[PDB]
Design an enzyme around this catalytic site. Structure first.
Site, mmCIF file in Angstrom:
data_model
loop_
_atom_site.group_PDB
_atom_site.id
_atom_site.type_symbol
_atom_site.label_atom_id
_atom_site.label_comp_id
_atom_site.label_asym_id
_atom_site.label_seq_id
_atom_site.Cartn_x
_atom_site.Cartn_y
_atom_site.Cartn_z
ATOM 1 N N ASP A 115 -125.119 34.437 39.706
ATOM 2 C CA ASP A 115 -125.194 35.088 38.380
ATOM 3 C C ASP A 115 -125.809 36.396 38.446
ATOM 4 O O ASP A 115 -126.702 36.658 37.667
ATOM 5 C CB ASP A 115 -125.725 34.347 37.275
ATOM 6 C CG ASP A 115 -125.554 34.824 35.830
ATOM 7 O OD1 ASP A 115 -124.444 35.680 35.655
ATOM 8 O OD2 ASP A 115 -126.223 34.444 34.918
ATOM 9 N N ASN A 171 -136.842 32.172 31.014
ATOM 10 C CA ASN A 171 -136.080 31.238 30.747
ATOM 11 C C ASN A 171 -135.829 29.994 31.578
ATOM 12 O O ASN A 171 -135.797 28.638 31.558
ATOM 13 C CB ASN A 171 -135.018 31.319 29.734
ATOM 14 C CG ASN A 171 -134.495 30.197 29.152
ATOM 15 O OD1 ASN A 171 -135.155 29.253 28.277
ATOM 16 N ND2 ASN A 171 -133.191 29.736 29.600
ATOM 17 N N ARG A 185 -139.019 43.948 31.632
ATOM 18 C CA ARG A 185 -138.159 43.516 30.395
ATOM 19 C C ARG A 185 -138.104 42.021 30.384
ATOM 20 O O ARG A 185 -137.793 41.655 31.797
ATOM 21 C CB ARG A 185 -137.018 44.121 30.326
ATOM 22 C CG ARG A 185 -135.918 43.735 29.316
ATOM 23 C CD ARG A 185 -134.758 44.432 29.255
ATOM 24 N NE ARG A 185 -133.537 43.645 29.875
ATOM 25 C CZ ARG A 185 -132.400 44.025 29.350
ATOM 26 N NH1 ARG A 185 -132.059 44.513 28.102
ATOM 27 N NH2 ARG A 185 -131.323 43.230 29.791
ATOM 28 N N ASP A 223 -136.584 38.605 29.991
ATOM 29 C CA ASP A 223 -135.169 38.112 29.741
ATOM 30 C C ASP A 223 -135.053 36.682 29.228
ATOM 31 O O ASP A 223 -135.889 35.899 29.817
ATOM 32 C CB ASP A 223 -134.364 38.376 30.842
ATOM 33 C CG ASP A 223 -134.113 39.963 31.326
ATOM 34 O OD1 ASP A 223 -134.294 40.804 30.173
ATOM 35 O OD2 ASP A 223 -134.163 39.976 32.298
ATOM 36 N N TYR A 247 -135.019 31.686 24.216
ATOM 37 C CA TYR A 247 -134.760 30.300 24.437
ATOM 38 C C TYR A 247 -135.756 29.478 25.106
ATOM 39 O O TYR A 247 -135.162 28.084 25.789
ATOM 40 C CB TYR A 247 -133.471 30.232 25.419
ATOM 41 C CG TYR A 247 -132.190 31.315 24.617
ATOM 42 C CD1 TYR A 247 -131.289 30.835 24.067
ATOM 43 C CD2 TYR A 247 -131.971 32.414 25.416
ATOM 44 C CE1 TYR A 247 -130.456 31.453 23.187
ATOM 45 C CE2 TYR A 247 -131.132 33.270 24.707
ATOM 46 C CZ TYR A 247 -130.162 32.737 23.891
ATOM 47 O OH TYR A 247 -129.133 33.574 23.397
ATOM 48 N N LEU A 248 -136.976 29.886 25.314
ATOM 49 C CA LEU A 248 -137.901 29.141 26.055
ATOM 50 C C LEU A 248 -138.059 27.624 25.555
ATOM 51 O O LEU A 248 -138.043 26.827 26.337
ATOM 52 C CB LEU A 248 -139.317 29.747 26.076
ATOM 53 C CG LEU A 248 -139.284 31.364 26.379
ATOM 54 C CD1 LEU A 248 -140.990 31.884 26.581
ATOM 55 C CD2 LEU A 248 -138.580 31.432 28.112
ATOM 56 N N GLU A 264 -137.316 24.229 23.267
ATOM 57 C CA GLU A 264 -136.381 23.890 22.239
ATOM 58 C C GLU A 264 -137.088 22.451 21.517
ATOM 59 O O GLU A 264 -138.202 21.981 21.920
ATOM 60 C CB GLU A 264 -135.617 22.800 23.522
ATOM 61 C CG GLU A 264 -134.497 23.692 24.090
ATOM 62 C CD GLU A 264 -135.368 24.376 25.554
ATOM 63 O OE1 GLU A 264 -136.017 23.354 26.210
ATOM 64 O OE2 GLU A 264 -135.201 25.427 25.722
ATOM 65 N N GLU A 291 -135.924 41.425 25.651
ATOM 66 C CA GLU A 291 -134.338 41.336 25.544
ATOM 67 C C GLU A 291 -133.903 40.280 24.443
ATOM 68 O O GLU A 291 -133.805 38.892 24.789
ATOM 69 C CB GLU A 291 -133.751 41.067 26.858
ATOM 70 C CG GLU A 291 -132.243 40.700 26.923
ATOM 71 C CD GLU A 291 -131.700 39.628 27.257
ATOM 72 O OE1 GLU A 291 -132.723 38.607 27.515
ATOM 73 O OE2 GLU A 291 -130.800 39.217 27.064
ATOM 74 N N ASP A 336 -124.877 43.084 25.914
ATOM 75 C CA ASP A 336 -126.217 42.591 26.470
ATOM 76 C C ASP A 336 -125.735 42.362 27.941
ATOM 77 O O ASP A 336 -124.693 41.485 27.953
ATOM 78 C CB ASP A 336 -126.557 41.423 25.762
ATOM 79 C CG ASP A 336 -127.982 40.899 26.502
ATOM 80 O OD1 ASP A 336 -127.617 40.188 27.331
ATOM 81 O OD2 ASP A 336 -129.080 41.011 26.071
#
Ligand SMILES: [Ca+2]
Ligand SMILES: [Ca+2]
Ligand SMILES: [Cl-]
Ligand SMILES: [Cl-]
Ligand SMILES: [Cl-]
Ligand SMILES: [Cl-]
Ligand SMILES: [Cl-]
Ligand SMILES: [Cl-]
Ligand SMILES: [Cl-]
Ligand SMILES: [Cl-]
Ligand SMILES: [Cl-]
Ligand SMILES: [Cl-]
Ligand SMILES: [Mg+2]
Ligand SMILES: [Mg+2]
EC number: 3.2.1.1
Lengths: 549, 290, 549
Positions: free
Chosen positions: A62, A104, A200, A202, A206-207, A209, A244, A314
């Site tokens: 990715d 994350n 930055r 990124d 979402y860290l 839940e 971000e 993004d």
């Protein structure tokens, strides 16, 4: 570099991929030594800080946002020693360096994850988020909904499900484990000790839940960000954290932290809707999409700064920010065939504007004069094109075009060994678009861009000045003043393709002399009558408002 | 499909030795009378992008990994010209083998003009770029804007559509396109290529692969279409002689198929043929006059 | 260089224009220093002697064959000192240098002519051929009949007619004036003293004129050539004189001088009909046009040598040699549409052969194995094309294509400042045809050509061997043996586009083993039965005939 806690407010950033800039070792892939050898160009262009996307060891499934080892440079780029060489050479020229750091998640090839799955009772057993079921957190959307059937994936070795907000080969780290928080703080310190000027951060929304939530922007997430800022503040003053967060601007302000402290999380965050609004303002020949987005942006802490750039997506998720409830342009983007065609694909500036030089100059002028610290993307300064068939991200990651020679002068390797090919078409190909060809004439896009950077650097108003929109007779023209208190600048921008007049009420500056910033010609002094300015289609002017004798 | 054929031909040329080809053919078991092998000049299956091999039964198993060209292209479909570094002599040699070895051949679109590929598009999509018809806009494949093509044409100096396209090759009798079309016409007129037996002739020189193909001949035939054929292929990059024992064909007249020139009649002595590097000849074996 | 009176018989020459090879000073024009900097390439290619077309001071109205000062280098090329630098650098590498010297005429800008016309009673008054009438020498044809109304031109300053065999701005020197003969001998000595290895003497058949004759090939002309040879023999042993006489071979033999002395005029002369005959032999797929031209060429003195090259036209006059009475192919050239299209235009080898690599190799093999000393033309070794619209001569004088970079790597100047542009088309353009691109693969035309030169250099038979045509069964194949006495080579050439067999009677060499010269493979030994060789279309083989143990 000597500590200067406001450097990022005055900086122009230059996003440059290690793999793409210069291949010094003829393996077909850009490298750290190569980037070091091109620092004289970067200094000459006039930018203040490099922004490097992830260059860590990675299987590159990715784009390198899938990290295998936070402590190691991808071998084809060099080693940590080459990175320090780059850092020192940049600092010697007064240039800083920041890099992307994905907080994350890691690649599933990371040794932590392989230990987590193979040795659940071991020290890494709780480093990731594991479950006997795929039922937890059902209110969290699947970001990559066309690719991932679920945010939970069943691991055949551990025989439990693990959580991932991104692709399945990118398992989420478990921030509820205190050892994970310490390990990630240690990653920050490792690069800061080497001398990097900032990161930055990124995927930070979402860290954490939590059941009953959509698992974004949680208070515990912000709490960890405060730990990062505190570590910076206490141990490495003068370094920067950029967020971000691809969210509506009102929601992003939270990432600067507590206003009562002057900001205690990120120093900077990106203003994502700016380019889509500028793009639509030009399409509609109306200043309103720009006026409105700026007017509706809430105040941020005084030591903080927005980052801005000329992109509609993004780079992590390939999503364009929007908001069904707070974006009046929400349904309008789909009505524009240009916006529609490029949904989910990064494109360079020249292709976004169909290679119209007047518009490239207009959009660049806005980037350099609107509130915030701007980021230039490598290659846009010569008008590079993209190659969409390479992928939604790789579209804009082709080699920097230095000369019209073999491989655009990026490498001595055979063309078939390049990591990606250069543009070869009649418009954007390296035979016609390259640094060498533009160095000579003072009228090339490259020299124009360099001159604009030089002009901006001589006026603090552009970096930290107030912003006052002037309104005016004509809705096709956007006019504003930037001011700091002794330095006042007037910017006027024609969003119409046709010539436009604008009458401005400049009474507050009556007597002042507008001096145009490129040719230094003195314009008629401001009086009590409205000041008429006339602009060609897509034109702009920058004026210094000079005090009378 | 007979998948190992191209990897073996590829290695035979790299090695300048007939054996990797001799061997896979000799070791291929007989198939039903009704049936036919399919053959093609690719090293990978298009579904899985895997090259066929076998640890126990392939004597070349470990040898592929030792060839840097082979190694570089693992898991990627490549077109014929790029596989052979655009060497025109080799393209003709591999094509001659494809058209004369046992089986029914499959040509891949664009190989007849020597199209290249674009590896960065993907492991399969590398070879799926538009057919290059003309040197016009989009290689004459489409009137659409270039940004709307499903994939872009080749644009480099070697394989790009300004240089490599159907229109440019139609004129000269010496273009790859015209050469390929003539080879197909020649093949279509000789039944032994399609359904003939296969007899490997051995010979003094290991660098040369020679074979004869024969039609069993039943009822109401007799003519060039059913005459035996002799094929000789030089796997070396250098000129090579080969002496063949063709005594069973004593008295027959080898007629070279493209120019129709009669070669000396076969005798009891070994028959000497000389080939340039990577060259080949096809002969019709004509029965002598009584 | 140490004197070696036979070096020219063993030499491969390389015709290279100073203006075209390499521009070292970024003025857009090739220069002597630039040529010096490229000597490593010339050495690597394997050629033995450079042949430079005229590089003297000149207004360049007829390609530099119109000379303004015999003692001065054209300023844009450098000075005499740069020429000596070039000479020394070449000699250091074992490479010699010869140059064109036009003997028959000067430019009208030459100071001799300006004195002749302005001061008739002065010392230059009789340096040219002057007359009150245009009636003298009426049997001499006008060479440039489509351009010049007469061989006499009326001068408005002197108010008499002067004679010129070439253009009107090229007045003929008066060789009946003894001071003219001495002045021209002095030109020879000037360059010989500098160290030049020899000259091609141009336009020499036209030196003297006589009533009742066609004013070519006169005995007084040959007498002056003997003076030149004697000066060489006595003062500069080991230097060479080459004759440019565009005549049927039987007529050219006179230019080697008196056979009873072993030759007392030119050491070398060109065999012009060779290429037209090879070209027609391939067009007709018959060895006869080549067999016949060689068989009908008379013997020359043993210390003399023919020069041969792959061109259909003399570069001075742009005429193809022929003979109504002695050339059986006389009427045949006009029937060939390829010959017809290119009448009066120099073309490079690849374009003459429609870029057919097999034929380029065949023609080059013949050039390197037929009797004589061959001349390679710069750029043919990489397959350069031409640009016919530039002019009948300038067609083949475009810049050497070194790399795919800007200006083909010939110059750093702007493209608009180049003396002539490089090829830019899809077939011959520098993006695809250049030295750099061909250096790598052993299968490029450049490396093939270099290897053929290396092979030729290892066999004295090619340079000075006898020539025996073998005949054979097949008229489509040309086979011959070159032999010197210990070194014997067999060459077989297929003039047909289709595969061909040939049976050769090689009984005289029975027992010998043919070893093919590129791969060293040993072929079946020669017996008493005819030896069968089989060739692909346009193919050739070279064999060393090795003595048996
Ligand atoms: Ca998470
Ligand atoms: Ca004369
Ligand atoms: Cl990178
Ligand atoms: Cl490292
Ligand atoms: Cl981004
Ligand atoms: Cl974008
Ligand atoms: Cl397949
Ligand atoms: Cl393949
Ligand atoms: Cl010159
Ligand atoms: Cl001089
Ligand atoms: Cl000539
Ligand atoms: Cl010519
Ligand atoms: Mg590299
Ligand atoms: Mg120069």
């Amino acid at each position: 570099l000597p500590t200067d806690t406001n450097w990022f407010k005055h900086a122009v950033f230059y996003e440059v991929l290690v793999r793409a800039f210069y291949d010094s070792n003829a393996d077909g892939i850009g490298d750290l030594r190569g980037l070091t050898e091109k620092l004289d160009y970067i200094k000459w262009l006039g930018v203040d800080c490099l922004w490097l996307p992830p260059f860590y060891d990675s299987p590159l499934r990715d784009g390198g946002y899938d990290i295998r080892d936070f402590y190691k440079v991808l071998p084809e780029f060099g080693t940590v020693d080459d990175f320090v060489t780059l850092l020192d050479a940049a600092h010697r020229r007064g240039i800083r360096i920041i890099t992307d750091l994905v907080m994350n998640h890691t690649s599933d090839q990371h040794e932590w994850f392989q230990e987590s799955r193979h040795n659940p009772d071991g020290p890494y057993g709780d480093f990731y988020v594991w479950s006997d079921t795929s039922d937890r957190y059902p209110d969290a959307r699947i970001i990559f909904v066309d690719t991932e059937e679920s945010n939970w994936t069943f691991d055949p070795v551990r025989r439990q499900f693990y959580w991932h907000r991104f692709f399945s080969h990118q398992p989420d780290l478990n921030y509820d484990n205190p050892a994970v928080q310490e390990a990630m703080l240690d990653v920050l310190r490792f690069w800061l000790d080497l001398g990097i000027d900032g990161f930055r951060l990124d995927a930070v929304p979402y860290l954490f839940e939590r059941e009953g939530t959509n698992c974004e922007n949680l208070p515990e997430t912000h709490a960890f960000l405060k730990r990062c800022r505190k570590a910076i503040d206490d141990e490495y003053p003068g370094r920067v954290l950029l967020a971000e967060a691809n969210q509506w601007p009102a929601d992003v302000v939270a990432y600067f932290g507590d206003p009562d402290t002057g900001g205690d999380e990120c120093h900077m965050a990106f203003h994502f809707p700016l380019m889509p609004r500028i793009f639509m303002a030009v399409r509609r020949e109306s200043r309103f999409p720009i006026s409105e987005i700026l007017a509706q942006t809430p105040p941020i802490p005084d030591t903080a700064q927005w980052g801005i750039f000329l992109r509609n997506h993004d780079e992590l998720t390939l999503e364009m920010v929007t908001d069904e409830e707070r974006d009046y342009m929400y349904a309008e983007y789909a009505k524009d065939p240009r916006m529609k065609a490029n949904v989910g694909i990064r494109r360079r500036l020249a292709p976004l504007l169909e290679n119209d030089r007047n518009q490239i100059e207009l959009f660049t002028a806005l980037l350099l004069s609107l509130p915030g610290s701007p980021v230039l993307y490598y290659g846009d300064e010569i008008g590079m094109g993209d190659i969409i068939w390479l992928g939604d991200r790789d579209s804009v990651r082709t080699p920097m075009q230095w000369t019209p020679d073999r491989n655009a002068g990026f490498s001595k390797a055979t063309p078939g060994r390049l990591y990606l090919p250069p543009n070869q078409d009649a418009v954007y190909g390296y035979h016609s678009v390259n640094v060498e060809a533009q160095l000579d004439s003072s009228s090339s896009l490259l020299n124009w861009t360099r001159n604009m950077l030089a002009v901006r650097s001589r006026h603090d108003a552009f970096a930290v000045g107030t912003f006052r929109e002037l309104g005016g007779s004509n809705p096709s023209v956007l006019a504003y003043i930037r001011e700091v208190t002794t330095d006042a600048v007037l910017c006027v921008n024609n969003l119409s393709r046709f010539p436009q007049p604008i009458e401005l009420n400049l009474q507050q500056w009556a007597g002042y002399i507008p001096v145009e910033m490129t040719g230094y010609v003195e314009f008629p002094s401001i009086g009590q009558l409205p000041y008429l300015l006339t602009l060609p289609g897509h034109g702009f002017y920058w004026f210094q408002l000079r005090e009378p004798d | 499909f007979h998948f190992p054929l191209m990897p073996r031909i590829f290695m035979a040329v790299r090695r300048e030795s007939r054996f990797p080809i001799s061997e896979i053919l000799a070791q291929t078991p007989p198939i039903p009378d009704t049936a036919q092998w399919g053959i093609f000049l690719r090293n990978h299956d298009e579904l899985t992008l895997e090259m066929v091999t076998d640890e126990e039964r392939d004597y070349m198993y470990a040898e592929y990994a030792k060839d840097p060209r082979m190694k570089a292209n693992v898991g990627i479909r490549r077109r014929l010209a790029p596989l052979l570094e655009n060497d025109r002599n080799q393209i003709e040699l591999f094509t001659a083998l494809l058209l004369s070895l046992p089986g029914s051949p499959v040509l891949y679109y664009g190989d007849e003009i020597g199209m290249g590929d674009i590896i960065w598009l993907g492991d399969r999509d590398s070879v799926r770029t538009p057919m290059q018809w003309t040197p016009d806009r989009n290689a004459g494949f489409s009137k659409a804007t270039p940004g709307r093509l499903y994939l872009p044409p080749n644009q480099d100096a070697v394989y790009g559509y300004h240089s490599v396209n159907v229109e440019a090759q139609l004129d000269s009798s010496s273009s790859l396109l015209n050469w390929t079309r003539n080879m197909l016409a020649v093949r279509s007129r000789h039944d032994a290529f399609a359904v003939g037996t296969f007899r490997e002739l051995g010979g003094s020189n290991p660098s040369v692969l020679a074979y004869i193909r024969e039609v069993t001949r039943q009822q109401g035939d007799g003519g060039a279409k059913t005459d035996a054929v002799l094929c000789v292929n030089n796997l070396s990059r250098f000129p090579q002689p080969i002496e063949l024992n063709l005594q069973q064909w004593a008295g027959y007249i080898p007629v070279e198929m493209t120019g129709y020139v009669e070669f000396p009649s076969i005798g009891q002595l070994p028959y000497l043929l000389t080939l340039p590097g990577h060259g080949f000849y096809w002969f019709q074996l004509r029965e002598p006059d009584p």
